[PDB]
């Protein structure tokens, strides 16, 4: 059997299912040298002109229910990044994705179990976890790639779920839905919120 290192270099695994798998990431390397050439030329207009995973998702998850297998880690990473050299735009996008998912969950109220813990507030719909709203005191490149893949998957997941603005400046099926219905709660500094009074 071909060793992992040997197979990676050629591109322990079965050669039958790996040889055929040899078929833009590589082409993107040319952009670095083009940018270096533009910098050497001393003119930025050419650089501006030069500047101006759906396929892998389907094979990994041929059907929407199959996403649930990795949704655990996907939501874990997304929520971890939502509260965390990652660019600020990536953090904002991760937070927005999590907020949209939470809003959709609240719309359907598809929640069954919850557990507040030291690690974080656990939830069940599928189980997912989110850390507290406090600062978090490793090679982030792997984390960045995992976040990108999970965000790409969650984009399609949210699109499927949805198919089936001054607040931005401030921010039956189960007993959970059956209970607390019409019980409008008021939350203090620790539904109406006192924080909005500020």
């Amino acid at each position: 059997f071909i060793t992992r290192s040997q197979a990676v270099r050629k591109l322990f695994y079965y050669a039958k299912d790996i040889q055929y798998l040899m078929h833009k990431f590589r082409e993107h390397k040319t952009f670095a040298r083009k940018l270096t050439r533009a910098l050497g030329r001393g003119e930025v207009s050419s650089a501006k002109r030069l500047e101006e995973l759906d396929h892998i998702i389907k094979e990994r998850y041929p059907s929407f229910p199959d996403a649930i297998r990795d949704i655990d880690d996907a939501l874990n990473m997304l929520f971890l990044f939502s509260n965390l050299q990652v660019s600020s735009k990536i953090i904002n996008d991760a937070q927005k994705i999590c907020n949209q998912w939470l809003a959709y969950v609240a719309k359907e109220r598809l929640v069954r179990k919850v557990f507040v813990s030291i690690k974080g507030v656990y939830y069940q719909a599928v189980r997912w976890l989110v850390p507290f709203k406090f600062p978090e005191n490793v090679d982030f490149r792997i984390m960045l790639t995992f976040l990108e893949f999970y965000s790409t998957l969650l984009h399609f997941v949210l699109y499927k779920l949805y198919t089936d603005l001054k607040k931005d400046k401030i921010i039956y099926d189960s007993p959970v839905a059956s209970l607390f219905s019409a019980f409008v709660f008021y939350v203090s500094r620790e539904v109406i919120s006192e924080a909005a009074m500020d």
Binding site: G40, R41, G42, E43, S45, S46, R49
Partner: protein, 148 residues
């Protein structure tokens, strides 16, 4: 130890004055292919009274045509041209015509400021900034011609 007509190169403008000359020349970068194409497309769309453009002169044949007419005020010459005969006579021609000339190391460096991979020579005829050009010419003269 070579004939005097050779080895006139390897004596070149100093780092500071060379950098100043490059900075001055970068102002008059000719419109690259993309910029000219987009500007022409914009003009055509607008159509669908004009000032004379200013840019550096770099073509060796074009520069030599401008040279000996006394129009060229300052000419830059690369010292690493493989056919040295193309540039052996240019300093003497400039001296005879009284046109200040400056030898700058690197044909690639000379061409990098004119949107070309390489450029044997570069010359300026028109200016936007005349005082700066005159001061640069005087500095180049005092630092190159009076020394070597």
């Amino acid at each position: 130890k070579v004939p005097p007509t050779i080895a006139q190169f390897q004596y070149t403008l100093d780092r500071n004055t060379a950098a100043e000359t490059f900075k001055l020349f970068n102002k008059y970068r000719p419109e690259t292919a993309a910029e000219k194409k987009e500007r022409l497309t914009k003009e055509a769309a607008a159509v669908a009274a004009s000032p004379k453009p200013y840019a550096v002169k770099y073509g060796l044949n074009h520069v030599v045509a401008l040279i000996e007419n006394k129009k060229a005020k300052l000419v830059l010459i690369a010292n690493d041209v493989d056919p040295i005969e193309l540039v052996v006579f240019l300093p003497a021609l400039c001296k005879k015509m009284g046109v200040p000339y400056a030898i700058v190391k690197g044909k690639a460096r000379l061409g990098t400021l004119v949107n070309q991979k390489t450029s044997a020579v570069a010359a300026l005829t028109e200016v936007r900034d005349e005082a700066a050009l005159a001061k640069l010419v005087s500095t180049i003269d005092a630092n190159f011609a009076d020394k070597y």
